[PDB]
Design an enzyme around this catalytic site. Structure first.
Site, PDB file in Angstrom:
ATOM      1  N   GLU A   1      -8.258  -9.055 -11.352  1.00  0.00           N
ATOM      2  CA  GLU A   1      -8.318  -9.126  -9.894  1.00  0.00           C
ATOM      3  C   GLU A   1      -9.746  -9.304  -9.460  1.00  0.00           C
ATOM      4  OE1 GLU A   1      -6.028  -6.003  -7.832  1.00  0.00           O
ATOM      5  OE2 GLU A   1      -4.191  -6.542  -8.818  1.00  0.00           O
TER       6      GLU A   1
ATOM      7  N   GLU B   1     -10.924   0.908  -6.797  1.00  0.00           N
ATOM      8  CA  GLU B   1      -9.887   0.491  -7.712  1.00  0.00           C
ATOM      9  C   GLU B   1      -9.418  -0.955  -7.445  1.00  0.00           C
ATOM     10  OE1 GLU B   1      -5.468   0.387  -7.183  1.00  0.00           O
ATOM     11  OE2 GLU B   1      -6.860  -0.266  -8.721  1.00  0.00           O
TER      12      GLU B   1
ATOM     13  N   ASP C   1     -15.966  -8.103   3.330  1.00  0.00           N
ATOM     14  CA  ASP C   1     -15.981  -8.234   1.913  1.00  0.00           C
ATOM     15  C   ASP C   1     -17.180  -7.452   1.333  1.00  0.00           C
ATOM     16  OD1 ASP C   1     -16.339  -9.486  -0.838  1.00  0.00           O
ATOM     17  OD2 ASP C   1     -14.567 -10.579  -0.144  1.00  0.00           O
ATOM     18  N   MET C   2     -16.969  -6.740   0.226  1.00  0.00           N
ATOM     19  CA  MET C   2     -18.064  -6.009  -0.409  1.00  0.00           C
ATOM     20  C   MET C   2     -19.171  -6.944  -0.936  1.00  0.00           C
ATOM     21  SD  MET C   2     -16.520  -4.576  -4.083  1.00  0.00           S
ATOM     22  CE  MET C   2     -14.946  -4.126  -3.343  1.00  0.00           C
TER      23      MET C   2
ATOM     24  N   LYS D   1      -2.858   8.589 -10.276  1.00  0.00           N
ATOM     25  CA  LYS D   1      -4.020   7.711 -10.143  1.00  0.00           C
ATOM     26  C   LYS D   1      -5.098   8.319  -9.253  1.00  0.00           C
ATOM     27  CE  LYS D   1      -5.168   3.922  -7.705  1.00  0.00           C
ATOM     28  NZ  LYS D   1      -4.656   2.935  -6.708  1.00  0.00           N
ATOM     29  N   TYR D   2      -4.672   8.860  -8.121  1.00  0.00           N
ATOM     30  CA  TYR D   2      -5.621   9.377  -7.145  1.00  0.00           C
ATOM     31  C   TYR D   2      -6.202  10.741  -7.569  1.00  0.00           C
ATOM     32  CZ  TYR D   2      -3.555   5.617  -4.402  1.00  0.00           C
ATOM     33  OH  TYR D   2      -3.101   4.399  -3.971  1.00  0.00           O
TER      34      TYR D   2
ATOM     35  N   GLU E   1     -13.511  -2.435   3.440  1.00  0.00           N
ATOM     36  CA  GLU E   1     -12.198  -3.061   3.248  1.00  0.00           C
ATOM     37  C   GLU E   1     -12.204  -4.463   3.838  1.00  0.00           C
ATOM     38  OE1 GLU E   1      -9.308  -2.362   1.383  1.00  0.00           O
ATOM     39  OE2 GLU E   1      -8.721  -4.257   2.272  1.00  0.00           O
TER      40      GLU E   1
ATOM     41  N   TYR F   1       0.834  -1.201   0.000  1.00  0.00           N
ATOM     42  CA  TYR F   1       0.000   0.000   0.000  1.00  0.00           C
ATOM     43  C   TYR F   1       0.881   1.269   0.000  1.00  0.00           C
ATOM     44  CZ  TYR F   1      -4.138  -2.884   1.396  1.00  0.00           C
ATOM     45  OH  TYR F   1      -5.136  -3.844   1.477  1.00  0.00           O
TER      46      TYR F   1
ATOM     47  N   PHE G   1       2.404   2.178  -3.644  1.00  0.00           N
ATOM     48  CA  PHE G   1       1.453   2.631  -4.637  1.00  0.00           C
ATOM     49  C   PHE G   1       0.679   3.885  -4.246  1.00  0.00           C
ATOM     50  CE2 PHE G   1       1.837  -1.950  -5.839  1.00  0.00           C
ATOM     51  CZ  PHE G   1       2.429  -1.718  -7.071  1.00  0.00           C
TER      52      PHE G   1
HETATM   53  C1  LIG Z   1       7.353  -2.536  -8.341  1.00  0.00           C
HETATM   54  N1  LIG Z   1       6.806  -3.003  -7.038  1.00  0.00           N
HETATM   55  C2  LIG Z   1       7.361  -2.625  -5.894  1.00  0.00           C
HETATM   56  N2  LIG Z   1       6.682  -3.195  -4.902  1.00  0.00           N
HETATM   57  C3  LIG Z   1       5.709  -3.928  -5.419  1.00  0.00           C
HETATM   58  C4  LIG Z   1       4.778  -4.674  -4.816  1.00  0.00           C
HETATM   59  C5  LIG Z   1       3.836  -5.377  -5.587  1.00  0.00           C
HETATM   60  C6  LIG Z   1       3.888  -5.285  -6.983  1.00  0.00           C
HETATM   61  C7  LIG Z   1       2.954  -5.989  -7.781  1.00  0.00           C
HETATM   62  C8  LIG Z   1       2.897  -7.398  -7.793  1.00  0.00           C
HETATM   63  C9  LIG Z   1       1.963  -8.071  -8.601  1.00  0.00           C
HETATM   64  N3  LIG Z   1       1.073  -7.314  -9.411  1.00  0.00           N
HETATM   65  C10 LIG Z   1       1.135  -5.958  -9.395  1.00  0.00           C
HETATM   66  N4  LIG Z   1       0.354  -5.202 -10.161  1.00  0.00           N
HETATM   67  C11 LIG Z   1      -1.105  -5.205 -10.184  1.00  0.00           C
HETATM   68  C12 LIG Z   1      -1.634  -4.419  -9.001  1.00  0.00           C
HETATM   69  O1  LIG Z   1      -3.032  -4.388  -9.145  1.00  0.00           O
HETATM   70  C13 LIG Z   1      -1.092  -2.970  -8.954  1.00  0.00           C
HETATM   71  N5  LIG Z   1      -1.900  -2.189  -8.010  1.00  0.00           N
HETATM   72  C14 LIG Z   1      -1.645  -0.746  -8.163  1.00  0.00           C
HETATM   73  C15 LIG Z   1      -2.444   0.054  -7.134  1.00  0.00           C
HETATM   74  C16 LIG Z   1      -2.443  -0.562  -5.853  1.00  0.00           C
HETATM   75  C17 LIG Z   1      -2.866   0.207  -4.756  1.00  0.00           C
HETATM   76  C18 LIG Z   1      -2.867  -0.346  -3.471  1.00  0.00           C
HETATM   77  C19 LIG Z   1      -2.479  -1.686  -3.263  1.00  0.00           C
HETATM   78  C20 LIG Z   1      -2.077  -2.474  -4.350  1.00  0.00           C
HETATM   79  C21 LIG Z   1      -2.057  -1.918  -5.640  1.00  0.00           C
HETATM   80  C22 LIG Z   1      -1.621  -2.732  -6.673  1.00  0.00           C
HETATM   81  C23 LIG Z   1       2.067  -5.292  -8.603  1.00  0.00           C
HETATM   82  C24 LIG Z   1       4.896  -4.472  -7.548  1.00  0.00           C
HETATM   83  C25 LIG Z   1       5.774  -3.818  -6.762  1.00  0.00           C
HETATM   84  N1  LIG Z   2     -14.471  -8.087  -2.508  1.00  0.00           N
HETATM   85  C1  LIG Z   2     -13.790  -7.159  -1.784  1.00  0.00           C
HETATM   86  N2  LIG Z   2     -14.337  -6.593  -0.689  1.00  0.00           N
HETATM   87  C2  LIG Z   2     -13.687  -5.644   0.046  1.00  0.00           C
HETATM   88  N3  LIG Z   2     -12.442  -5.238  -0.237  1.00  0.00           N
HETATM   89  C3  LIG Z   2     -11.771  -5.724  -1.300  1.00  0.00           C
HETATM   90  C4  LIG Z   2     -12.425  -6.748  -2.141  1.00  0.00           C
HETATM   91  N4  LIG Z   2     -11.549  -7.051  -3.114  1.00  0.00           N
HETATM   92  C5  LIG Z   2     -10.430  -6.303  -2.906  1.00  0.00           C
HETATM   93  N5  LIG Z   2     -10.558  -5.521  -1.817  1.00  0.00           N
HETATM   94  C6  LIG Z   2      -9.557  -4.547  -1.316  1.00  0.00           C
HETATM   95  O1  LIG Z   2      -9.485  -3.508  -2.313  1.00  0.00           O
HETATM   96  C7  LIG Z   2      -8.236  -2.813  -2.245  1.00  0.00           C
HETATM   97  C8  LIG Z   2      -7.789  -2.606  -3.692  1.00  0.00           C
HETATM   98  C9  LIG Z   2      -6.524  -1.780  -3.909  1.00  0.00           C
HETATM   99  N6  LIG Z   2      -6.163  -1.941  -5.307  1.00  0.00           N
HETATM  100  C10 LIG Z   2      -6.762  -0.280  -3.693  1.00  0.00           C
HETATM  101  C11 LIG Z   2      -6.289   0.262  -2.347  1.00  0.00           C
HETATM  102  C12 LIG Z   2      -6.748   1.721  -2.157  1.00  0.00           C
HETATM  103  N7  LIG Z   2      -8.123   1.915  -2.617  1.00  0.00           N
HETATM  104  C13 LIG Z   2      -5.784   2.559  -2.937  1.00  0.00           C
HETATM  105  O2  LIG Z   2      -6.084   3.013  -4.078  1.00  0.00           O
HETATM  106  O3  LIG Z   2      -4.670   2.687  -2.406  1.00  0.00           O
HETATM  107  C14 LIG Z   2      -7.332  -3.749  -1.472  1.00  0.00           C
HETATM  108  O4  LIG Z   2      -6.994  -3.138  -0.237  1.00  0.00           O
HETATM  109  C15 LIG Z   2      -8.148  -5.034  -1.264  1.00  0.00           C
HETATM  110  O5  LIG Z   2      -7.876  -5.684  -0.024  1.00  0.00           O
END
Ligand SMILES: Cn1cnc2ccc(-c3ccnc(NC[C@H](O)CN4CCc5ccccc5C4)c3)cc21
Ligand SMILES: Nc1ncnc2c1ncn2[C@@H]1O[C@H](C[C@@H](N)CC[C@H](N)C(=O)O)[C@@H](O)[C@H]1O
Ligand SMILES: Cn1cnc2ccc(-c3ccnc(NC[C@H](O)CN4CCc5ccccc5C4)c3)cc21
Ligand SMILES: Nc1ncnc2c1ncn2[C@@H]1O[C@H](C[C@@H](N)CC[C@H](N)C(=O)O)[C@@H](O)[C@H]1O
Ligand SMILES: Nc1ncnc2c1ncn2[C@@H]1O[C@H](C[C@@H](N)CC[C@H](N)C(=O)O)[C@@H](O)[C@H]1O
Lengths: 625, 303, 625, 322
Positions: C432, C423, C407-408, C321-322, C380, C312, C315
């Site tokens: 995902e 997202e 869970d949603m 993105k935000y 969450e 978290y 990213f």
């Molecule tokens: C470059 N890098 C540095 N630390 C990392 C951790 C996980 C990943 C990683 C591993 C597997 N798949 C992905 N990409 C798809 C994800 O959906 C990317 N998003 C992007 C936005 C986001 C926000 C909050 C929490 C997680 C996420 C992950 C990233 C990449 C990392």
């Molecule tokens: N079915 C679900 N119900 C509730 N939470 C979920 C579900 N699927 C995924 N998530 C959560 O959704 C978040 C997705 C992230 N990509 C986004 C994190 C946050 N919104 C951000 O932009 O930093 C993660 O923290 C997951 O644990």
């Protein structure tokens, strides 16, 4: 310098506390990740629906601080092995919850106690956690030398502390750790945080922990004494254990409050620092070995492979091996040519397996030390070293040295030798086929010719060591027998281990060998009297050799050649650990086997129980002829 | 002191012997040039007339007139060394670094004022020796150039051959200077060349497989051929006779001598390593001198 | 700064030469390990018995110098593929000999040419060497853009250089490298030393080498031009290739003599340094990605696993993105509540998958930007992030934000939403389970409610890349299907690769989805027109999403959101490479599949030949519901 | 490295052609070496190298009282289990005319030299049982004018199509070894559901005796198979031919197959990946025979119309033990 942490069970503010302890000198901090008193409910309403937050936030530290400075602690109310079902289920769920949180946080370690005999369910929950995903924390099990029940004040009138000593009983906590660790199938992620008490138990209770994976030692303030000027120090006997623990290399953990009000917490620490400043400096051997403790090597395939230039480089630096050879060559020369013959008699000396030339030079130094005259052949099968050699005899040696590029078993010698010189020895003596090599070479030694070495003998000792058992287990490869790792020996600088009996001679070879019929196969039975309780994981091998007369080399601990780092010990594992009890005999059997293409070892334990015969047929391990 | 690998041996018109050699192993990889007025005293360094060290190995050499020595160097240089006034020193006249890789072959064209060099860099160069410059540069070939050989009597005509399997006849007077020549069917790689010193129209070539062949430029056709050797043919040297004999040297470590129909008159196993050059005495036309990587200088007697 | 070596084929003294070139600026030196002119004999006497030494000695350099400064070269007379048997056998034995010597020496690389079509036997000998023991040298195959035969001067009267252009012919040398590399079964130890010529061949001949494992580029002095003040420089077109080669990151090698007599060798070098000093600086994205090129990640199991705090953290730092989300929330608010309703109308906004709260804050910023009023739920499923969230709404958000731990798909919502914000997107959009997650959540969006995102679309493009093909192949594990590595996608920052056709839309999802009967399964056929010759190794996936109206996010290269590093591309391999020719169509088919427990993808190529259907049944790869 | 089982000798001893072909070779050789005037004066020394349970020893004996000439016989055999059958034969039947010898032919110190060595050490690809290496180390005891029977042999290859066999190979994957090893070893197989894509072409050839100054049994060979159909290549059928004596031959090459001879099925050399071939294309394949002091193996690669990986590099999946 020591690496040490502070153990706390009270943290009002995280930022403050981390700072305070860092100021004092600590490298890290062991703290609760939830409030130790905060019993949560997971099933029954209304308690289950307690509004959050369930604990304090990750934002309070940097990602880096979490990863390097904090060791988690399981909450002390979590009792997975309680006899009350509801407590058993809240604990199961809360242990998961706290463990998931440490993993979320990226914590490098996490503490859980073994404070009682039955930890089955704790073990099961943790095993399950370990096999869920991809997280990285070590788990440190907090176990005491002495159980709390065996440590109490004798101040209950109708429940006296039992006076008559029990050899077994006082080892009860080793068996806590042992069962737990067996349950969890020896996970490399589970190590020992050994808690040291004010009263040490007997040696035998403490040795018990020899060869276990101790990652930390926990020192309560209460066990420290006070010196003349009021500072904290430890008893002589505690110091001895600190030294053994420093040697092992672990992390120290100070626990409890300041019981020396006159000074701050850094005083305890400064004593530990004092202790490690004051230990002996690393000897020459210990400096060479420094990076290699319990690191497992496949032994060299001496004939089928050619050594690399840097491998000859490292060992050419041995401060003892070559000067021992020189002295053997020296004594031999005198014994074979009298003073009256000195200028008339020219000894033919052959170096069989000459590498980059150090034994050729040592020969040359031996001649103008004995003041006698020699003709030298330098035989070498490795054509790459032959390049070094032939560049040596052009630039330096001259026609006094005849460089020969071939196998010693193959060479047609122009003349016969007075003396053959070789070092074809591995850590178990004959495990590089020195016998087979010198056998096929001996037809060119004169009838009264000397071989240097004249003889060698291997030795075996049974050992305990979970760490090494786990290093072997981890050597499983794709596309081969899943148990082969256990059916081959390893050259290893044995470090975290306990040797269970004194080394006993195994195989012996003599050169020359004018046995009417030469047989290099061997079968041997050894009986190792054991006087402790323990678990057997393998056999350390070593060797001794007679270069000439009283000139020897040795890696047997009792007679080890000082400074000689050219050979680490060898390890012969067994597939399955075997429990041995005080007063039992370990019986082991080794065979040396061959055919025309290869040589191998096969071994089996026959008492106190049998193991499978290991390496039948050289199925997992041979040495190529 | 003299490096073991003898590369070249050439008699001057006055009977004195020019020697070239490299160090092809050991610590230092260099070369040297030697003059031996007493040819029977070769290759002892103390009993030589002159001698010098060169920067790098010598892949080839040739006399330039009477006092010049033109050298093909490992370094990519073509160099010209000048014989002393006394003829007791050997002095560097020029060292020119024009090739991108080992210069493997060098030859003086008829009028003694120009030379062609050949390289592993696949190039062929034409040199003004007085000017110390590259006049022309030709990438005709597609692999390393093995041998260049000037015609006896024409400054613009020379043979060349490469591991790209082409034998080329050259004539710098034509817009397109080279012209591919040789046997009917493409055979084994051409490894050595020598023009006939009398009939300026005919040459011989040796191949990688030990065959020596005779070529008419007129017929664009291979006249005769014989399997002389069991290994590659590295040199071909015609005798100075009216009807010249042909000396044949090889990596099979032997020398042979053949007549004009290529029949074997003589063979010498004297060497125990590669035979690198042959040179006929200007004085005793039946005396033939070979050198090799055994560091032997052998004087043969040819019937 | 560039890393560059000097290529020499003449070394009189090793110490001198190494010094000279180090002085000039070079990081390393490519030289012969035996004298290039020293043809050895291995069978026939007397030549075979040539007294040694066979070459110069290892003692002349330190072990470290050998390992870091020297690149070996095969002797140019070694011709394993000659038509003469004896030459074929001396070469086989001499190639072994030189290769064994480089390994003895510990050399980091070793050069061998592909200077002709048939290199079978060279390939076989090298393969055999590679499978003998445990040595570490890379092998750099020296291949030219343009074959020597296609480069010659047109100066042979009766052998003219053929004038009419052949698209295929001019790619002849790629096919040299291709066959060689196929023969040796794609060994990760064999890479390209691409030789650049004075005349570049056409683009298409050079692009051919896109996605190959180029470790070095060899620049002859001869290809450099001369500027006003006499210094060496390159043509505009050569510079373009230098830049592409710098971007790829390779080592440069200067070969040939000084053709600019006015200055020393460091002048050539200083031009290369000039060139790399002068390229654009890394943009924000390129700086984030810096360590990740062609590094393969298993994609997140988004539901079955809980993300770590540091994930978290990384990213949350996305600079685009935000603020894109904020702008979507902003525009939506205005569209739903008129100015007259502004203080009367309170919009219910739900953040589904709220993580540590950034989309909750972005919502809040969107409200006092639109100047409208909102009630927020923060749902969450990850209870560890819920800790961060609940600590946020106590210290900051207040009762305006209702944190919900579940869970949603599970939550029973107290009221209905005006707007859901989420997202839940992976690099292939829906990988995902955003569709399944938003589907089970939508029952609590009001009939006129908006989802943000409103829709997303995935895209595919075929790619060439031996490097990535080899990274996948290397992902074979014990205890599973030996080909599973190829039947799962990887998140990867695609770097050493060539994209063969432009991306084409694959799957599309819309939210809300009031399809009478919801089906998230999909089947799609794509036809990719290819206009080069090449080898197909996989499909790069990307995605686009409509947050709100014209507010988008994208990782499709053509429409990539600038600065957005939150998603790398995804890679879908195929088990076996497929040859494609100029003007052919690649046809690929993807299915999205599910049951109640999991979702997966299955894919197959159907033209110009078929592949096996990949991942049938989710046998190697599923995404857990 | 292995000893054949009694029932294996049993099955092949029933070959109705192989032994009568040997008899006829021994017959013709005897006449050629001893003239009618020498017939009762000249006793030929005949050695059977790898004598098994004795059929080639009997065939020798029948050849002698057919040629009406006189012979002394050695019966050498490395398999001590068959040596039991042999030594029970020479007590009950052969008598001191046959000297049974229990050892390897590469090892035996022979009391005298041979006029004629007789052996059948042949596999389906001719030399794949190390007949060359075995006869090489035995030849020092053949007289300078001595004959070997066989005098020579030649292997042959043909490319084949067959999904069935491709699938039988694929199914040979085992635990605890390279998951692709199945494809890097040849198989003796009675090829049935298959298509042969080009006519067989000679591969390796060996001659006995071999008084090559320097003996080398390694080989490298390139074959070009013109294909006139569209198809998919899955492997190479190998076969062989041998010259026993003069015009007396054995063959499993289809075009010249010895009738009734069942002692050898064809051999199959798979490739890891099928290769598409088109009408009018050439399949190019390359085979190497390789050795060291411990073992012999084959390595192969297709080079046209596309390349395959080099198969079995180093004998990594398949060697033949010396
Ligand atoms: C470059 N890098 C540095 N630390 C990392 C951790 C996980 C990943 C990683 C591993 C597997 N798949 C992905 N990409 C798809 C994800 O959906 C990317 N998003 C992007 C936005 C986001 C926000 C909050 C929490 C997680 C996420 C992950 C990233 C990449 C990392
Ligand atoms: N079915 C679900 N119900 C509730 N939470 C979920 C579900 N699927 C995924 N998530 C959560 O959704 C978040 C997705 C992230 N990509 C986004 C994190 C946050 N919104 C951000 O932009 O930093 C993660 O923290 C997951 O644990
Ligand atoms: C600590 N260390 C640093 N570099 C090493 C290389 C090999 C080994 C190594 C690997 C496997 N077995 C061994 N030990 C048994 C050997 O017989 C030790 N001898 C010791 C003497 C010697 C002299 C010249 C060349 C090789 C040797 C090797 C050492 C250890 C090394
Ligand atoms: N049968 C053999 N014939 C010839 N050389 C051998 C044989 N077996 C081993 N060697 C060589 O013997 C050397 C053994 C080394 N332990 C000693 C190197 C050298 N004598 C030293 O003390 O540094 C290696 O260089 C081997 O390559
Ligand atoms: N090097 C060797 N030395 C001695 N015997 C061998 C050797 N190699 C193979 N053999 C034996 O040769 C026999 C070969 C068989 N094909 C022939 C059996 C018998 N001659 C027959 O035709 O029935 C086997 O019995 C092997 O055990």
């Amino acid at each position: 310098r020591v690496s040490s942490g502070r153990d706390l069970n009270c943290v009002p503010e995280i930022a403050d506390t981390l700072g305070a302890v860092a100021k004092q000198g600590f490298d890290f901090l062991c703290m609760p990740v939830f409030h130790p008193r905060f019993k949560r409910e997971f099933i029954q309403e209304p308690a289950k629906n307690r509004p959050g937050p369930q604990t304090r936030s990750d934002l309070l530290l940097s990602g880096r601080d979490w990863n390097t400075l904090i060791v988690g602690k399981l909450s002390p109310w979590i009792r997975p092995d309680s006899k009350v079902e509801k407590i058993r289920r809240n604990s199961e769920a809360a242990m998961l919850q706290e463990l998931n949180f440490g993993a979320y946080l990226g914590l490098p370690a996490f503490l859980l106690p073994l404070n009682q005999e039955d930890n089955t369910n704790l073990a099961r929950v943790l095993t399950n956690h370990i096999h869920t995903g991809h997280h990285s924390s070590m788990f440190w099990m907090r176990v005491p030398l002495v159980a709390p029940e065996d440590l109490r004040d004798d101040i209950i009138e109708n429940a006296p502390t039992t006076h008559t000593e029990e050899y077994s009983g006082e080892e009860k906590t080793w068996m806590w750790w042992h069962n737990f660790r067996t349950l969890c199938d020896y996970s490399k992620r589970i190590a020992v945080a050994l808690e040291i008490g004010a009263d040490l138990p007997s040696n035998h209770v403490i040795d018990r922990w020899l060869g276990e994976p101790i990652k930390a030692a926990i020192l309560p303030t209460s066990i420290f004494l006070t010196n003349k000027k009021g500072f904290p120090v430890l008893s002589k006997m505690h110091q001895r254990l600190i030294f053994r623990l420093l040697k092992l290399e672990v992390q120290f953990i100070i626990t409890g409050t300041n019981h020396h009000s006159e000074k701050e917490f850094c005083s305890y620490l400064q004593y530990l620092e004092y202790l490690s400043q004051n230990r002996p400096p690393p000897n020459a051997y210990e400096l060479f070995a420094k990076g290699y403790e319990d690191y497992l090597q496949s032994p060299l395939q001496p004939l089928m492979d050619n050594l690399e230039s840097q491998t000859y480089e490292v060992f050419e630096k041995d401060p003892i091996k070559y000067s021992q050879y020189q002295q053997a060559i020296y004594k031999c020369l005198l014994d074979r040519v009298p003073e009256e013959e000195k200028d008339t008699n020219v000894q033919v000396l052959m170096v069989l397996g000459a590498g980059r030339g150090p034994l050729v030079n040592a020969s040359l130094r031996a001649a103008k030390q004995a003041d006698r005259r020699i003709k030298l052949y330098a035989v070498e099968k490795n054509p790459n070293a032959v390049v070094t050699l032939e560049n040596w005899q052009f630039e330096e040696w001259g026609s006094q040295v005849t460089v020969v590029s071939s196998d010693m078993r193959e060479w047609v010698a122009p003349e016969k030798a007075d003396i053959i010189v070789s070092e074809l020895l591995g850590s178990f003596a004959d495990n590089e086929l020195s016998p087979e090599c010198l056998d096929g070479a001996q037809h060119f030694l004169k009838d009264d010719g000397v071989s240097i070495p004249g003889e060698y003998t291997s030795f075996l000792a049974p050992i305990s060591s979970s760490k090494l058992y786990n290093e072997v287990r981890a050597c499983r490869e794709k596309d081969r027998d899943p148990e082969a790792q256990f059916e081959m020996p390893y050259v290893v600088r044995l470090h975290n281990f306990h040797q269970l009996s004194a080394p006993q001679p195994c195989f012996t070879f003599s050169h020359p060998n004018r046995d009417p019929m030469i047989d290099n196969n061997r079968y041997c039975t050894l009986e190792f009297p054991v006087e402790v309780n323990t678990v057997l994981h393998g056999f350390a091998g070593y060797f001794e050799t007679v270069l000439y007369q009283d000139i020897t080399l040795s890696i047997r601990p009792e007679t080890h050649s000082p400074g000689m780092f050219s050979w680490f010990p060898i390890l012969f594992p067994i597939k399955q650990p075997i429990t041995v009890r005080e007063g039992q005999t370990i019986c082991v059997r080794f065979w040396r086997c061959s055919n025309s293409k290869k040589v191998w070892y096969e071994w089996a334990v026959t008492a106190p129980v049998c193991s499978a015969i290991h390496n039948p047929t050289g199925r997992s391990y041979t040495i190529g002829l | 002191c003299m490096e073991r690998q003898l590369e070249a041996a050439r008699y001057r018109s006055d009977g004195a012997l020019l020697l070239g050699a490299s160090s092809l192993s050991g610590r230092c990889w260099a070369g040297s040039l030697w003059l031996f007025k007493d040819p029977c005293a070769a290759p002892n360094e103390g009993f030589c007339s002159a001698g010098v060290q060169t920067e790098a190995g010598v892949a080839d050499l040739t006399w330039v007139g009477e006092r010049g020595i033109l050298v093909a160097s490992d370094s990519g240089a073509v160099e010209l060394w000048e014989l002393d006034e006394n003829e007791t020193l050997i002095v560097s006249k020029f060292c020119k670094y024009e090739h991108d890789d080992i210069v493997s072959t060098v030859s003086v064209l008829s009028s003694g004022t120009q030379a062609v060099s050949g390289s592993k860099d696949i190039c062929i160069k034409v040199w003004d020796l007085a000017q110390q410059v590259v006049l022309s540069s030709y990438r005709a070939h597609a692999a390393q150039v093995t041998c260049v050989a000037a015609s006896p009597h024409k400054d613009s005509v020379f043979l060349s051959c490469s591991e790209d399997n082409r034998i080329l006849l050259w004539d710098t007077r034509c817009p397109k200077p080279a012209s591919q020549i040789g046997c009917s069917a493409p055979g084994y790689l051409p490894t050595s060349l020598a023009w006939h010193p009398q009939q300026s129209e005919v040459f011989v070539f040796g191949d990688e497989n030990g065959t020596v062949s005779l070529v008419d430029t007129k017929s664009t056709s291979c006249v005769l051929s014989s399997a002389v050797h069991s290994q590659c043919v590295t040199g071909l040297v015609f005798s100075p006779h009216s009807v010249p004999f042909l000396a044949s040297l090889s990596e099979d470590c032997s020398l042979a001598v053949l007549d004009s129909s290529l029949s074997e008159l003589f063979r010498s196993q004297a060497h125990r390593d590669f035979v690198r050059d042959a040179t006929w005495s200007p004085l005793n036309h039946s005396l033939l001198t070979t050198v090799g990587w055994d560091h032997q200088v052998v004087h043969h007697v040819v019937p």
